[PDB]
Write an enzyme that holds these catalytic residues in place. Structure first.
Site, mmCIF file in Angstrom:
data_model
loop_
_atom_site.group_PDB
_atom_site.id
_atom_site.type_symbol
_atom_site.label_atom_id
_atom_site.label_comp_id
_atom_site.label_asym_id
_atom_site.label_seq_id
_atom_site.Cartn_x
_atom_site.Cartn_y
_atom_site.Cartn_z
ATOM 1 N N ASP A 35 0.850 -1.195 0.000
ATOM 2 C CA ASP A 35 0.000 0.000 0.000
ATOM 3 C C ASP A 35 0.884 1.243 0.000
ATOM 4 O O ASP A 35 1.367 1.654 1.060
ATOM 5 C CB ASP A 35 -0.880 -0.032 1.229
ATOM 6 C CG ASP A 35 -1.794 1.178 1.291
ATOM 7 O OD1 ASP A 35 -1.900 1.884 0.292
ATOM 8 O OD2 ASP A 35 -2.434 1.375 2.356
ATOM 9 N N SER A 199 -0.566 15.696 -11.953
ATOM 10 C CA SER A 199 -0.798 15.358 -13.344
ATOM 11 C C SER A 199 -1.029 16.634 -14.170
ATOM 12 O O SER A 199 -1.585 17.623 -13.645
ATOM 13 C CB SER A 199 -2.026 14.415 -13.442
ATOM 14 O OG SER A 199 -2.414 14.184 -14.751
#
Ligand code: NA
EC number: 3.4.23.22
Length: 330
Positions: A35, A199
């Site tokens: 994770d 992004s």
């Protein structure tokens, strides 16, 4: 040193991935959920409340000659999905894919929430976010990566998750055979303890690319892609009959649909998520309403590039003095 381990989807939907981990002496092999959005290595154990264990493999510290209680240490964690776990702490030897760390904090669960009990395939979590998020008290502990880092050939790990197929976690090296083209690296903020990046924009299907900054985290422990409501609305508007369902808890779409791809930007580069990756199947068994793999992050307080996004790429988690992320097509 290096390590290399295969990671396997837990079910036909790729809801999560499990990777075998050797703990203790002799080895006890547990299948952990790696994770990159959390920083605790915790396991089902011989200490876990018996009624909260249903099929998991447990770690039994009393059977490990290298286990030692970390006296006074406790832990307690709550995840984004509302799940939780807590317990006490041992140090022991932990190996992943041939890479060994001695003295790793192994957090032994005394209590787990119902979603952990109900998932027989996941024996615990191995956190790979920054050690500043580790929950052990009163002495915070390091992740497996942070303890391995100085021994590694390069201070990196890579995630290569499969679509309906196994993939690989590598530690300490780049497998230049595992991706196509070149790797585009992008800046990381560690201020929230995550692999947080920005992004450069998105496209829906064959549509034009929209240049827009989207701050979010690279999180292998989250199944879906959670993005701003504007972006998510623009995606599902291209699917006839898709709608946001407050009763189901997100966007649903007709199981008869063919989904468009979704592209996200990494600098000047582009990662394309095929439409098929966005189908999470019937909302309930036999339904013709299917659950979408792109959902709104509104109310979660962060955008999350979970497995839907990450499995479309070869992803480099660069733990050099100044961390960075890298993405390549594959
Ligand atoms: Na669900």
């Amino acid at each position: 040193s290096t390590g290399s381990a295969t990671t396997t989807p837990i079910d036909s939907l790729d809801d999560a991935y499990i990777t075998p981990v050797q703990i203790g002496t002799p080895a006890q092999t547990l299948n952990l959920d790696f994770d990159t959005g959390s920083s605790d290595l915790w396991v089902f154990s011989s200490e876990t409340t018996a009624s909260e264990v249903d099929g998991q493999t447990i770690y039994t510290p009393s059977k490990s000659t290298t286990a030692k209680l970390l006296s006074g240490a406790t832990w307690s964690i709550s995840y984004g999905d509302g799940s939780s776990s807590s317990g006490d702490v041992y140090t022991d030897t932990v190996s992943v894919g041939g890479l060994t760390v001695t003295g790793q904090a192994v957090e032994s669960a005394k209590k787990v929430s119902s979603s952990f009990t109900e998932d027989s395939t996941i024996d615990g979590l191995l956190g790979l976010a920054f050690s500043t998020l580790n929950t052990v008290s009163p002495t915070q502990q390091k992740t497996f990566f942070d303890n391995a880092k100085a021994s590694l050939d390069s201070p990196v790990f890579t995630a290569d998750l499969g679509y309906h197929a196994p993939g690989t976690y590598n530690f300490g090296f780049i497998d230049t055979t595992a991706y196509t083209g070149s790797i585009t690296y992008t800046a990381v903020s560690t201020k929230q303890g995550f692999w947080e990046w920005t992004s450069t924009g998105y496209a829906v299907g064959s549509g034009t690319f929209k240049s827009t900054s989207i701050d979010g985290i690279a999180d292998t422990g989250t199944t879906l892609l959670y993005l701003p409501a504007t972006v998510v609305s623009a995606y599902w508007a291209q699917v006839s009959g898709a709608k946001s369902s407050s009763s189901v808890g997100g966007y649903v779409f007709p199981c008869s649909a063919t989904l468009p791809s979704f592209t996200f930007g990494v600098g000047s580069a582009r990662i394309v998520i095929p439409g098929d990756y966005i189908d999470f199947g019937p909302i309930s068994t036999g339904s013709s309403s299917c659950f979408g793999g792109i959902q709104s992050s509104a109310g979660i307080g962060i955008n999350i590039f979970g497995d839907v996004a990450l499995k479309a790429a070869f992803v480099v988690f660069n733990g050099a003095t100044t961390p960075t992320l890298g993405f390549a097509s594959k």
